[PDB]
PDB file of N, CA and C in Angstrom:
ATOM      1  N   UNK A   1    -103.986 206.078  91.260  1.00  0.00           N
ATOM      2  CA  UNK A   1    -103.611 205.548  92.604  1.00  0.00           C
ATOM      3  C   UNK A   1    -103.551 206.725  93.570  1.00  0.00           C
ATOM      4  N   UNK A   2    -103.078 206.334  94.743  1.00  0.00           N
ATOM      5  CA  UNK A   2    -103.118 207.461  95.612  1.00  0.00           C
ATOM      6  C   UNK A   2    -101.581 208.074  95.790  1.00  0.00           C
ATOM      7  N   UNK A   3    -102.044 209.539  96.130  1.00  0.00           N
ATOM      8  CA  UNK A   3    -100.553 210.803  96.553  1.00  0.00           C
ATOM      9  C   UNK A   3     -99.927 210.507  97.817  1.00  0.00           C
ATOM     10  N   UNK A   4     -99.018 210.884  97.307  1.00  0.00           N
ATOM     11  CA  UNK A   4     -98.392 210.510  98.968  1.00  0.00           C
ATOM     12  C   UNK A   4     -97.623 212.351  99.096  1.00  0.00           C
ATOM     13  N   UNK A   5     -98.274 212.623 100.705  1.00  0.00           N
ATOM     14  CA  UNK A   5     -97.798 214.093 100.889  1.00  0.00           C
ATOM     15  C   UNK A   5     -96.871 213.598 101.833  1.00  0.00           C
ATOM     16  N   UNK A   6     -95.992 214.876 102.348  1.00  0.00           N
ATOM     17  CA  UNK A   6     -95.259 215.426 103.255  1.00  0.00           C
ATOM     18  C   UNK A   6     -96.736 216.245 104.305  1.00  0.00           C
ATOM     19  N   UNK A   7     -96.750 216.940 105.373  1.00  0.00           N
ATOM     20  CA  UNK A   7     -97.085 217.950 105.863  1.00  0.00           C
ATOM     21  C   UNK A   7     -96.131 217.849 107.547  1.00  0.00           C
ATOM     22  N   UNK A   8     -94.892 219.299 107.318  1.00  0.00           N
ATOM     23  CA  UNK A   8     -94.289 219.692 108.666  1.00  0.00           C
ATOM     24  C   UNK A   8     -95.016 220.803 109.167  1.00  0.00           C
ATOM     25  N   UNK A   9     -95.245 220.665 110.855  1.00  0.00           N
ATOM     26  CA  UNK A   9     -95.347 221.654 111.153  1.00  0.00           C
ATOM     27  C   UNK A   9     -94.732 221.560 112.701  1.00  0.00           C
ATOM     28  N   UNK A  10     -94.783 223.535 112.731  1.00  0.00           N
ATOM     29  CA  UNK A  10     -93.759 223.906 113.745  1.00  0.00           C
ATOM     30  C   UNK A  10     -94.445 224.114 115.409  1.00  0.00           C
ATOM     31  N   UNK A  11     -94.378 223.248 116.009  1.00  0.00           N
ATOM     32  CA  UNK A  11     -95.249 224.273 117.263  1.00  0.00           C
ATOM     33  C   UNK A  11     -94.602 225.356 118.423  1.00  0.00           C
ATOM     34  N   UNK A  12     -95.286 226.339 118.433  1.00  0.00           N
ATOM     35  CA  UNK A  12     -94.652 227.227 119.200  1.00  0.00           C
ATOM     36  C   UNK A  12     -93.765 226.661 120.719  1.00  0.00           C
ATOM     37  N   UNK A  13     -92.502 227.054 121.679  1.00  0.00           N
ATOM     38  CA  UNK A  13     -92.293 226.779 122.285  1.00  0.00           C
ATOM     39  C   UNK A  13     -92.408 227.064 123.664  1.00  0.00           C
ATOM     40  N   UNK A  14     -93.478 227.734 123.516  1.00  0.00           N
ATOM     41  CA  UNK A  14     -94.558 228.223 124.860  1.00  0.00           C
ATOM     42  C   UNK A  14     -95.782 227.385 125.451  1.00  0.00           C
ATOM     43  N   UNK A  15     -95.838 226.486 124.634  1.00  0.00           N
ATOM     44  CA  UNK A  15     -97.053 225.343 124.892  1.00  0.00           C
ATOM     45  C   UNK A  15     -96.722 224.283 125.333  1.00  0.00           C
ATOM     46  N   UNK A  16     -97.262 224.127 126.290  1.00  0.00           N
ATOM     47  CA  UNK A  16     -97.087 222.802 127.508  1.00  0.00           C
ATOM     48  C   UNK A  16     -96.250 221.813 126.797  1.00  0.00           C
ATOM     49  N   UNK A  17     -95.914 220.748 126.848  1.00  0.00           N
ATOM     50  CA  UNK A  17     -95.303 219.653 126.356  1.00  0.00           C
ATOM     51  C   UNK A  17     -96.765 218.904 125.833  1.00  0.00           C
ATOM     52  N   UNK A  18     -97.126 218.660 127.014  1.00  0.00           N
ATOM     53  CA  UNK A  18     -98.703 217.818 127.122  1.00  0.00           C
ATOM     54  C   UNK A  18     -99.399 218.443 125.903  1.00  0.00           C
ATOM     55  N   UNK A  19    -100.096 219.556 125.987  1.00  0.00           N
ATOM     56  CA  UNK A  19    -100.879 220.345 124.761  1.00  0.00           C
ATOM     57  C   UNK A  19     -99.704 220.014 123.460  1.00  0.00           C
ATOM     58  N   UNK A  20     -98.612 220.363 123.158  1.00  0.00           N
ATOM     59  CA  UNK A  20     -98.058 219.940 122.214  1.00  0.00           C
ATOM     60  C   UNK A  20     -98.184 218.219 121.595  1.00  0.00           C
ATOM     61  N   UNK A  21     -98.497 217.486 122.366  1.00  0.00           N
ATOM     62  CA  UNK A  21     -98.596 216.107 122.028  1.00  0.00           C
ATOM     63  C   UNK A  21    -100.333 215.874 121.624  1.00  0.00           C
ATOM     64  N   UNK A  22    -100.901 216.733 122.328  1.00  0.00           N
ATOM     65  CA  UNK A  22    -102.271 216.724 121.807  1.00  0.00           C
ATOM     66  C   UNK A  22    -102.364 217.865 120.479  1.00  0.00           C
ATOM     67  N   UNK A  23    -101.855 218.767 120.143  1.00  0.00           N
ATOM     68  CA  UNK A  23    -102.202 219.102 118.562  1.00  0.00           C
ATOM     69  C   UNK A  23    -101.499 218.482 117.793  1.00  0.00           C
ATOM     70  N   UNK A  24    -100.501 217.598 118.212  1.00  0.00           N
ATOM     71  CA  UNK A  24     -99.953 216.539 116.967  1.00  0.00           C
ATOM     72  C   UNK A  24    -101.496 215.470 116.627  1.00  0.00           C
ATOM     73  N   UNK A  25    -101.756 215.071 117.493  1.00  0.00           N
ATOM     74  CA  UNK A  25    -102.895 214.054 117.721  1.00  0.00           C
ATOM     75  C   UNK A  25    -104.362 214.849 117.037  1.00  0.00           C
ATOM     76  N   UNK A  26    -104.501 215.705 117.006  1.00  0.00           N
ATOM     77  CA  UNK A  26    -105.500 216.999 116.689  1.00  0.00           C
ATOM     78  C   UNK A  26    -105.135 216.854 114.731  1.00  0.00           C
ATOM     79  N   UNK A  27    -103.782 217.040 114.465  1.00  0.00           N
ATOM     80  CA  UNK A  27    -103.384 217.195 113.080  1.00  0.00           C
ATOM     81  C   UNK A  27    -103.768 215.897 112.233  1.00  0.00           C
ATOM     82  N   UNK A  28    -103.578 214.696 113.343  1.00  0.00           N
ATOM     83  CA  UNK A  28    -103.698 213.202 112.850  1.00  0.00           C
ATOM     84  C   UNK A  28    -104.921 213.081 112.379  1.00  0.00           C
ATOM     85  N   UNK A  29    -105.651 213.505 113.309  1.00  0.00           N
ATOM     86  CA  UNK A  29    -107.118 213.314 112.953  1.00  0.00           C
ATOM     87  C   UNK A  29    -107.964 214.535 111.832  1.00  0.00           C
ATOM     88  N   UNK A  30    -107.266 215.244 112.084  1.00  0.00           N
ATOM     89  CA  UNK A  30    -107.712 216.354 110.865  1.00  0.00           C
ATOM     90  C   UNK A  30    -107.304 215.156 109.354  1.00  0.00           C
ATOM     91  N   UNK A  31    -105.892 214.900 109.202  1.00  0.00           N
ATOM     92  CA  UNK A  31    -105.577 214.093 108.280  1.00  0.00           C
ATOM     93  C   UNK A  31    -107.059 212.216 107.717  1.00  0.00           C
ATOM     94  N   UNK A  32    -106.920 212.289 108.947  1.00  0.00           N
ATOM     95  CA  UNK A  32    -107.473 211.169 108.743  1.00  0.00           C
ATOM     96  C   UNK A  32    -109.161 210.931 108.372  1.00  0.00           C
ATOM     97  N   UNK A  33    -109.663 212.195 109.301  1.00  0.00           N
ATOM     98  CA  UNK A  33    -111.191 212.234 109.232  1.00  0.00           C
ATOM     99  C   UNK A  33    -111.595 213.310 108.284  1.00  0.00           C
ATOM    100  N   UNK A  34    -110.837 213.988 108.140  1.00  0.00           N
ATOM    101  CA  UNK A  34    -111.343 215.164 106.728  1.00  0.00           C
ATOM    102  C   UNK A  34    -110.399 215.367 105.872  1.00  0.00           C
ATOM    103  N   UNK A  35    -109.478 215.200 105.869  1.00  0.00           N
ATOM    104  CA  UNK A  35    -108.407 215.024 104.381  1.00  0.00           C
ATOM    105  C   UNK A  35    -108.633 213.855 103.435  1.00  0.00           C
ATOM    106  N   UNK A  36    -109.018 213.086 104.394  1.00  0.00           N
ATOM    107  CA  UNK A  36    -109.254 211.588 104.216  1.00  0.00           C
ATOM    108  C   UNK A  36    -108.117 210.581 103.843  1.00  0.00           C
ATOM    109  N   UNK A  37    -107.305 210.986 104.671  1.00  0.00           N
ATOM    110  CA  UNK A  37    -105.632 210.632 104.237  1.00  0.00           C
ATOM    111  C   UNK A  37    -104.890 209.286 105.023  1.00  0.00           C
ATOM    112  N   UNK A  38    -104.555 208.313 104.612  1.00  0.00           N
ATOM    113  CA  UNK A  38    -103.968 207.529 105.892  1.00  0.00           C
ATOM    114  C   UNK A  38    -102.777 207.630 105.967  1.00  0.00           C
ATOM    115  N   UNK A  39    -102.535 207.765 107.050  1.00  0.00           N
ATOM    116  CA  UNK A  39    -101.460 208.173 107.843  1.00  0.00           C
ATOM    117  C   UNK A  39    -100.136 207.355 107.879  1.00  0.00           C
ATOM    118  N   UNK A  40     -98.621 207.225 107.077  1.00  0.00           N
ATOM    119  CA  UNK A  40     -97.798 206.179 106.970  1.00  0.00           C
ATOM    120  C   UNK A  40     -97.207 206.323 107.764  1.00  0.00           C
ATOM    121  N   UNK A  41     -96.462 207.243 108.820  1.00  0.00           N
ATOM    122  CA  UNK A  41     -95.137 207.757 109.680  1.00  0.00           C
ATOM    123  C   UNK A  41     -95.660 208.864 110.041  1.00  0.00           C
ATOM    124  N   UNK A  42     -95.421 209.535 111.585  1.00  0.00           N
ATOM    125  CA  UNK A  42     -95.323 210.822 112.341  1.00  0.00           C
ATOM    126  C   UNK A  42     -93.899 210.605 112.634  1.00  0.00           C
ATOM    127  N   UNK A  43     -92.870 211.699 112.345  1.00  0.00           N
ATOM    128  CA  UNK A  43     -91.390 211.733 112.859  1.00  0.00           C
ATOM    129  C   UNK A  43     -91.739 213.297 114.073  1.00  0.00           C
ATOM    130  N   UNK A  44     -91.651 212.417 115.297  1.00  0.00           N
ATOM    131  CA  UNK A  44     -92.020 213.854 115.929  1.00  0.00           C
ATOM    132  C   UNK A  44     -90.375 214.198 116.256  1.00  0.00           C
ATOM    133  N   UNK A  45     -90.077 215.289 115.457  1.00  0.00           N
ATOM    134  CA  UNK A  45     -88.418 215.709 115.902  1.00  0.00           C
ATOM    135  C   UNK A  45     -88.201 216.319 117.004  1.00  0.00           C
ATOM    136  N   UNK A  46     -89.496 216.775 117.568  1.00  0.00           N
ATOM    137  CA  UNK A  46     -88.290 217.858 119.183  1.00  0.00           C
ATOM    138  C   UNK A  46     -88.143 218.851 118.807  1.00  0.00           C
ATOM    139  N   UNK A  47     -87.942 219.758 119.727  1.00  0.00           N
ATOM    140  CA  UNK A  47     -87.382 221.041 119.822  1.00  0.00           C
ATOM    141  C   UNK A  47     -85.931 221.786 118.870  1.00  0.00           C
ATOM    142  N   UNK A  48     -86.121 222.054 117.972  1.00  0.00           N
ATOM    143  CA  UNK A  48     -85.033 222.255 116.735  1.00  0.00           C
ATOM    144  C   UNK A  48     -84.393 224.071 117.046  1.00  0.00           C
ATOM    145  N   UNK A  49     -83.213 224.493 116.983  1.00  0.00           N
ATOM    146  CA  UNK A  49     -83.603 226.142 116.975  1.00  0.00           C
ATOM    147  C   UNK A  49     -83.521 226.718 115.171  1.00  0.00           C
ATOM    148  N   UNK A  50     -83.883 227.492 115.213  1.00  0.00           N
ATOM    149  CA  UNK A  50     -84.125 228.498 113.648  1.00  0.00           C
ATOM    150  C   UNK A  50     -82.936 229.237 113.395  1.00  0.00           C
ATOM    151  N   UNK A  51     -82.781 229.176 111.998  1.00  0.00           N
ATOM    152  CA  UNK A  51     -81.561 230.241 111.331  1.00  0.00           C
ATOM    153  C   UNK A  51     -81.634 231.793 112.359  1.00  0.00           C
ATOM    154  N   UNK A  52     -82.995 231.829 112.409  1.00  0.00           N
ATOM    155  CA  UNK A  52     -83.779 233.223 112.797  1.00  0.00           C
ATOM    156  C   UNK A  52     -84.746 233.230 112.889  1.00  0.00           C
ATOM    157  N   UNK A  53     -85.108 234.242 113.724  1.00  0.00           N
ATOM    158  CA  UNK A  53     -86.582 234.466 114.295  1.00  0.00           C
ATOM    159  C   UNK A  53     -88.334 233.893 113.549  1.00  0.00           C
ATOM    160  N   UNK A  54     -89.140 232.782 113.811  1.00  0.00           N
ATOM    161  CA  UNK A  54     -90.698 232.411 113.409  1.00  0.00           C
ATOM    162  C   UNK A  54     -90.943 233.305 114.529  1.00  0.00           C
ATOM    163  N   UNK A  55     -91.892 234.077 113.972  1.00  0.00           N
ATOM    164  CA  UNK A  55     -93.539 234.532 114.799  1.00  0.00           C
ATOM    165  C   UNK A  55     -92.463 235.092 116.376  1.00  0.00           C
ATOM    166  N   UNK A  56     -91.007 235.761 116.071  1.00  0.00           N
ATOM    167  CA  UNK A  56     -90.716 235.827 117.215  1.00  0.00           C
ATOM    168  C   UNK A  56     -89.892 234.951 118.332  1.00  0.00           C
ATOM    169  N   UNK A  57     -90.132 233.440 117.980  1.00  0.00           N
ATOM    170  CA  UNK A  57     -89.037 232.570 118.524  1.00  0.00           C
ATOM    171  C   UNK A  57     -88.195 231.954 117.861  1.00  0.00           C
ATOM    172  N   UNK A  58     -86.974 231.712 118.777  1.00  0.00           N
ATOM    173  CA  UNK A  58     -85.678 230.997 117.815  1.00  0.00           C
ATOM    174  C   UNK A  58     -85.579 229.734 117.750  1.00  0.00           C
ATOM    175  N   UNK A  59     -86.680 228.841 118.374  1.00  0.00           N
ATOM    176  CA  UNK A  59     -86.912 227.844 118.307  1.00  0.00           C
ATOM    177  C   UNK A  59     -88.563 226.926 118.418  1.00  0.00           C
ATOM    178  N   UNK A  60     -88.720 226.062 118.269  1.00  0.00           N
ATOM    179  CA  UNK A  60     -89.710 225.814 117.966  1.00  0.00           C
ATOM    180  C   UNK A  60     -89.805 223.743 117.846  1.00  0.00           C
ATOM    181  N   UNK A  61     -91.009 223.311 118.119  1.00  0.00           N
ATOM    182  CA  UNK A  61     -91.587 221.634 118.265  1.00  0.00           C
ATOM    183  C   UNK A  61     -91.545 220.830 116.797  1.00  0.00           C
ATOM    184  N   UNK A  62     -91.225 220.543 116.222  1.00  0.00           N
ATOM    185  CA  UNK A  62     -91.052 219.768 114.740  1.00  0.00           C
ATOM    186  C   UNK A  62     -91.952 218.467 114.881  1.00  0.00           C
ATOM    187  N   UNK A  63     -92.637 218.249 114.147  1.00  0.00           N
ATOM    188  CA  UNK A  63     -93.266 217.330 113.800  1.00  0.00           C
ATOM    189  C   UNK A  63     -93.755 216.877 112.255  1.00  0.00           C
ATOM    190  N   UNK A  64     -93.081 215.814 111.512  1.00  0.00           N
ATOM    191  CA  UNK A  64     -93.542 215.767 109.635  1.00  0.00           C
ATOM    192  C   UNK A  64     -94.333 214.310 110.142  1.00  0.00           C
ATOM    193  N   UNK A  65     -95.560 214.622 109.073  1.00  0.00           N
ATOM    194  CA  UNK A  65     -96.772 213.559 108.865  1.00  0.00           C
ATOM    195  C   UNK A  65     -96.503 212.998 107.568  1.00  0.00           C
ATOM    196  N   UNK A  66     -96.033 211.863 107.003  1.00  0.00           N
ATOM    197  CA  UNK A  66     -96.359 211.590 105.542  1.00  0.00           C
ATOM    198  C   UNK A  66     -97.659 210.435 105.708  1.00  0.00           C
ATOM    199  N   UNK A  67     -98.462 210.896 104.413  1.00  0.00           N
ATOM    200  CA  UNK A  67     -99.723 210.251 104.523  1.00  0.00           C
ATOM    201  C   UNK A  67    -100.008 210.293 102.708  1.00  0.00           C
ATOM    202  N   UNK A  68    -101.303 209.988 102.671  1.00  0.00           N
ATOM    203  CA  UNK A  68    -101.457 209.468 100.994  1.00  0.00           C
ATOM    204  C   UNK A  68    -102.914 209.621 101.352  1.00  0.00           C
ATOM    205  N   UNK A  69    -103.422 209.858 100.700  1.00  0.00           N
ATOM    206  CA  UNK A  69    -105.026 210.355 100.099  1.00  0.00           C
ATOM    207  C   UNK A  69    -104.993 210.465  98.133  1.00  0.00           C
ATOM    208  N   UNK A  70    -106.269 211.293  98.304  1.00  0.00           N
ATOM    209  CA  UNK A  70    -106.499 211.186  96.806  1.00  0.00           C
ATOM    210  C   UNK A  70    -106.430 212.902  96.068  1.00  0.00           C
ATOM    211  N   UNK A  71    -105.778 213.523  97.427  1.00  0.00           N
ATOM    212  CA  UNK A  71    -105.579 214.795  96.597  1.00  0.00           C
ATOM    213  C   UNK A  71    -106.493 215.769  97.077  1.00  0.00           C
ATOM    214  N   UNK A  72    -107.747 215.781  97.402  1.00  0.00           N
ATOM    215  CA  UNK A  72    -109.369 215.887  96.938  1.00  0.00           C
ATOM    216  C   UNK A  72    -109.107 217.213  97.905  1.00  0.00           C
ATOM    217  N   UNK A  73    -109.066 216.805  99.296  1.00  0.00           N
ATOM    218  CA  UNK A  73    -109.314 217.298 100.265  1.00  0.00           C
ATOM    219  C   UNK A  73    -107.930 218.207 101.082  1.00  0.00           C
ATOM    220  N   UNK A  74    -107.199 218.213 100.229  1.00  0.00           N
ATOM    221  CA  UNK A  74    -105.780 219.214 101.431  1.00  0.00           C
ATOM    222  C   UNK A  74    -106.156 220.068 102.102  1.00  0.00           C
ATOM    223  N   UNK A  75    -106.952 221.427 101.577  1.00  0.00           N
ATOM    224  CA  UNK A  75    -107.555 222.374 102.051  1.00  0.00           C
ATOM    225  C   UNK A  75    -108.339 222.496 103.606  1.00  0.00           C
ATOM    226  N   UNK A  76    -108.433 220.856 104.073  1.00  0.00           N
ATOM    227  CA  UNK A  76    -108.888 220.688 105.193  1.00  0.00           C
ATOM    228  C   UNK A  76    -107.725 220.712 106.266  1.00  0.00           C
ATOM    229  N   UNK A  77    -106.550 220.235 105.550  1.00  0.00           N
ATOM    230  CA  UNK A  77    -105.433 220.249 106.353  1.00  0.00           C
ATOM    231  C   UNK A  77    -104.870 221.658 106.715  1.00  0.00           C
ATOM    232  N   UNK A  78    -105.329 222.657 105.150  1.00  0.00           N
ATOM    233  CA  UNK A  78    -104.771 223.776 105.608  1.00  0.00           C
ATOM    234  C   UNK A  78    -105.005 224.685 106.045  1.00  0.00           C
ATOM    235  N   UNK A  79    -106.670 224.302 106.255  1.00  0.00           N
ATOM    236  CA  UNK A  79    -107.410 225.426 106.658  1.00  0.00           C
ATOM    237  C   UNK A  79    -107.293 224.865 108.617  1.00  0.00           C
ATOM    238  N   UNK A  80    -107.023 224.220 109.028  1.00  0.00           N
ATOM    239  CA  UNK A  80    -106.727 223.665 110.524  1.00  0.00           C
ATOM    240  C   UNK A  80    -105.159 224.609 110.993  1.00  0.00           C
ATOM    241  N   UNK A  81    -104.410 224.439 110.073  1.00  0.00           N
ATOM    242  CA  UNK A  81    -102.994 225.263 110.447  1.00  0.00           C
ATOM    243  C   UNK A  81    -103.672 226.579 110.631  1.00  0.00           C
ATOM    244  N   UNK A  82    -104.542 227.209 109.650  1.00  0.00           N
ATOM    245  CA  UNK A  82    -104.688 228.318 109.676  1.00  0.00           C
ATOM    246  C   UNK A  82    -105.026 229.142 110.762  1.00  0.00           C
ATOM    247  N   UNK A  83    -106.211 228.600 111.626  1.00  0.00           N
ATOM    248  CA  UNK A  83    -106.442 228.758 112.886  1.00  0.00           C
ATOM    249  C   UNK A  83    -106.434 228.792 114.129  1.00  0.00           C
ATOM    250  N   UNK A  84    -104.897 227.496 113.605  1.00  0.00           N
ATOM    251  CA  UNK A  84    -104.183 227.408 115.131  1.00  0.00           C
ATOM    252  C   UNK A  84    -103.401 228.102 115.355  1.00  0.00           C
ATOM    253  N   UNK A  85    -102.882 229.400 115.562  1.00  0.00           N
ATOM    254  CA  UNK A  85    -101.657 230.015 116.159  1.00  0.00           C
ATOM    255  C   UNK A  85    -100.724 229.504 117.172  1.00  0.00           C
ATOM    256  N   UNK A  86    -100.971 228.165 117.829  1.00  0.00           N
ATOM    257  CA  UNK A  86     -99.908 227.514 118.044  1.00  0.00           C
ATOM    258  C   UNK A  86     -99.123 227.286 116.990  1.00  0.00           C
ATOM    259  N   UNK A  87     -99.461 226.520 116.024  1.00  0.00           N
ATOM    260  CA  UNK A  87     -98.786 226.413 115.206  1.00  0.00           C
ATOM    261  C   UNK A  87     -98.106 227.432 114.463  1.00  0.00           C
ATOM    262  N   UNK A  88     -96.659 227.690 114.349  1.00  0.00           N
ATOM    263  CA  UNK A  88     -96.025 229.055 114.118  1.00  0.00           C
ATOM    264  C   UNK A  88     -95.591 228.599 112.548  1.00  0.00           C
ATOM    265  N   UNK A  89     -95.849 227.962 111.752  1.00  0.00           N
ATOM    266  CA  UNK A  89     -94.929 227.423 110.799  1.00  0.00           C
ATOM    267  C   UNK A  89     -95.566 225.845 110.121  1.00  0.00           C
ATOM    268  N   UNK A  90     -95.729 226.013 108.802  1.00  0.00           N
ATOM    269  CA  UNK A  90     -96.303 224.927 108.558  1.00  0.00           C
ATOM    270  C   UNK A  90     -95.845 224.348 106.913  1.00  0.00           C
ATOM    271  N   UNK A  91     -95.853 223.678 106.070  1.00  0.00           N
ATOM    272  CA  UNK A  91     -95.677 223.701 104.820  1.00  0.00           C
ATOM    273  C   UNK A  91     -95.706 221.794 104.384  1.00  0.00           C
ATOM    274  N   UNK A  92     -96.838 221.704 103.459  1.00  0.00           N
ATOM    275  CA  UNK A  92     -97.227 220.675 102.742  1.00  0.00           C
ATOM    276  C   UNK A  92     -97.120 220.649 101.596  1.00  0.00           C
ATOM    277  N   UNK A  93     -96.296 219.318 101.019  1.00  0.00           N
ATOM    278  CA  UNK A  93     -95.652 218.654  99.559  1.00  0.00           C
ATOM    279  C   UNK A  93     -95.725 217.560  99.596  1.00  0.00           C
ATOM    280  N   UNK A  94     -96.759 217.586  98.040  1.00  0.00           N
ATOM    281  CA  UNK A  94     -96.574 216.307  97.141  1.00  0.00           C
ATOM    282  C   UNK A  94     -95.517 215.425  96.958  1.00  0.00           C
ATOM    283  N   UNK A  95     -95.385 214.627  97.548  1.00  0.00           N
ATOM    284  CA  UNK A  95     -93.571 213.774  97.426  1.00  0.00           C
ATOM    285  C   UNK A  95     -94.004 213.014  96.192  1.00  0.00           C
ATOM    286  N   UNK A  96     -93.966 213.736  95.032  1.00  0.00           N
ATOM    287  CA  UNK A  96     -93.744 212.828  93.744  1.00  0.00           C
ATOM    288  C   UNK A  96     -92.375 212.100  93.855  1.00  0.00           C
ATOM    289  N   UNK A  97     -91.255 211.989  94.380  1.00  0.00           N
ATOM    290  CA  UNK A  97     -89.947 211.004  94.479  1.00  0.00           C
ATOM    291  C   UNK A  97     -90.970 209.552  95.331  1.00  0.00           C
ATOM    292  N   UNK A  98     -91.304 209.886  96.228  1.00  0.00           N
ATOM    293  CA  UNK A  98     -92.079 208.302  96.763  1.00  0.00           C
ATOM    294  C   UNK A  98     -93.080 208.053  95.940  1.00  0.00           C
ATOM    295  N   UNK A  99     -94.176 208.651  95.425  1.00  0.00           N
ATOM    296  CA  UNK A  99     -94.272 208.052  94.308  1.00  0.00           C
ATOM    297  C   UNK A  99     -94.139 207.097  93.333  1.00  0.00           C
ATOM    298  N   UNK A 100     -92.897 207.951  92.974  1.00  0.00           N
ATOM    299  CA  UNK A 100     -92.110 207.340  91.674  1.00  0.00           C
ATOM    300  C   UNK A 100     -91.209 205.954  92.250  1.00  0.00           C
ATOM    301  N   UNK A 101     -91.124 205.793  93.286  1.00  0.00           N
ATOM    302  CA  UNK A 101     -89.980 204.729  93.933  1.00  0.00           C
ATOM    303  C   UNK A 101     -90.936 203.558  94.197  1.00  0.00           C
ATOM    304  N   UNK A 102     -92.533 203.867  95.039  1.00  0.00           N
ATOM    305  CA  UNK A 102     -92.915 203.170  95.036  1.00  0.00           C
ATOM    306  C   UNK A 102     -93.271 202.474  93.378  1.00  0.00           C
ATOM    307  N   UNK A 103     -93.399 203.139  92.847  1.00  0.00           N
ATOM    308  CA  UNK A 103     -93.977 202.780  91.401  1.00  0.00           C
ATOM    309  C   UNK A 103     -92.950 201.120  90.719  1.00  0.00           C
ATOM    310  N   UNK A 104     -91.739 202.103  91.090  1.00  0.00           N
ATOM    311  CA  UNK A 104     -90.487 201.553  90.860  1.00  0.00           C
ATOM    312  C   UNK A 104     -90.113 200.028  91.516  1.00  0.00           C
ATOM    313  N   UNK A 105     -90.550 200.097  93.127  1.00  0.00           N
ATOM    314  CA  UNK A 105     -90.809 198.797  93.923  1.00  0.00           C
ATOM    315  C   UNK A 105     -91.312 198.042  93.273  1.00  0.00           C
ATOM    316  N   UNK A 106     -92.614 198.135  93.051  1.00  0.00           N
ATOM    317  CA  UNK A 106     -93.493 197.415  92.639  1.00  0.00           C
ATOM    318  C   UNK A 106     -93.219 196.648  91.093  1.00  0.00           C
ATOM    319  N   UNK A 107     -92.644 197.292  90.267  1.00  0.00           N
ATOM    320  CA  UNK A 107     -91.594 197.523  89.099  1.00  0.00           C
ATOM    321  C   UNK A 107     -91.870 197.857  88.096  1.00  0.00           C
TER     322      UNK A 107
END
C-alpha cells in the first residue's frame, strides 16, 4: 500500500508574504507532479521564533505537508529544498504511527 510522509519546512523571514505563499504552492506541486505523492493536509503554521539562530534568523514561516506516495521518488522533494535558499530548514519522515492506525481503522 502506500507511505504516508511528514515533510516541514522553514521559510526564511525576509520573503514577501506573497512569495512565501507561492513556494508553499511550488512544494505542492513538486509533491504532486514529481514525488508523485497526494497531498492529505498543508498546516501552514506562521511565523514561529527558534530556540536559536537558522541560517542567522530567530525566526522563521512553518509550513508541514503530509502526503502518501509509494516511496519511489522523495529525492525529488529533496533535491527542490536543496536549491531553494529560501527555504532555511527542512526535514522529511516516514509517519509509520499513521500507517499503523490507519491499518488499525480499517481493522
Amino acid at each position: 500500500k502506500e507511505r504516508i510522509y511528514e515533510s516541514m519546512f522553514i521559510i526564511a523571514p525576509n520573503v514577501p508574504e506573497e512569495e512565501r505563499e507561492n513556494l508553499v504552492e511550488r512544494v505542492k506541486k513538486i509533491i504532486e507532479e514529481r514525488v508523485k505523492g497526494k497531498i492529505d493536509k498543508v498546516e501552514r503554521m506562521g511565523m514561529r521564533k527558534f530556540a536559536y539562530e537558522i541560517k542567522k534568523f530567530n525566526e522563521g514561516d512553518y509550513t508541514v505537508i503530509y502526503f502518501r506516495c509509494d516511496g519511489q521518488n522523495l529525492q525529488e522533494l529533496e533535491n527542490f529544498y536543496r536549491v531553494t535558499p529560501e527555504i532555511i530548514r527542512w526535514q522529511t519522515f516516514r509517519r509509520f504511527d499513521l500507517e499503523k492506525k490507519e491499518r488499525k481503522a480499517q481493522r
